[PDB]
Write a structure and sequence with these properties.
monomer; mainly alpha; 63% helix; DNA-binding; dna binding protein; zebrafish TRF2; Telomere DNA
Length: 54
DNA sequence: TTAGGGTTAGGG
DNA sequence: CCCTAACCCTAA
């Protein structure tokens, strides 16, 4: 069953993009305790986030 | 391993 | 429901 991204999970992705740049999905995943999220999930979530503008 | 188009299932 | 966010597919 798919799982909605929490606000904490979302905030981790913003700080990861700030600290390491966009496209560095596997580097951002190792910098935060992402449980059950792959680097592709992070890439998809970011595209989702820029559409909703977050 | 990531980018970008495509797929799907669950929540608004 | 059914739209869209969370998924998948794959070239390079």
């Amino acid at each position: 069953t798919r799982k909605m991204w929490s606000v904490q999970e979302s905030e981790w992705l913003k700080q990861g993009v700030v600290r390491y740049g966009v496209g560095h999905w596997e580097r951002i995943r190792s910098a935060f305790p992402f449980a059950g999220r792959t680097a592709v999930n992070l890439k998809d979530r970011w595209r989702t986030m820029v559409k909703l503008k977050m």
